[PDB]
């Protein structure tokens, strides 16, 4: 929330997201980087 | 035929000596050292209602 001269977290969702195995093996076994994305089921949902 | 004569006697041990002394046994530690410490903080609550 960004009030008049100061700002405050109003809430801080913290998640640990598996890679998934296609990234493990082209990207980060291969090449030694990751996509700066995060798709994964939580919640019995695909959030990306 | 003629007897045996007295055979050399075995000799009491001389015994061991000893010194006297005041002993202190020390083992390896393994007590985390201890202190106190204080925390100041806040807890900061952020209810959506
Ligand atoms: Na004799």
């Not at chain 1, 405050?8 to 994305?37: H, L, Y």
């Amino acid at each position: 929330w960004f009030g008049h001269r100061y700002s405050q977290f109003m809430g801080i969702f913290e998640d640990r997201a598996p890679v998934p195995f296609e990234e493990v093996i082209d990207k980060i076994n291969a090449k030694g980087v990751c996509r700066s994305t995060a798709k994964y089921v939580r919640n019995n949902m695909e959030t990306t | 035929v003629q007897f045996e004569q007295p055979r050399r006697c075995p000799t009491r041990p001389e015994g061991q000596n000893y010194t006297e002394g005041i002993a202190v046994v020390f083992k390896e530690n393994i007590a985390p050292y201890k202190f106190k410490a204080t925390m100041y903080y806040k807890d900061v609550t952020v209810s959506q209602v």
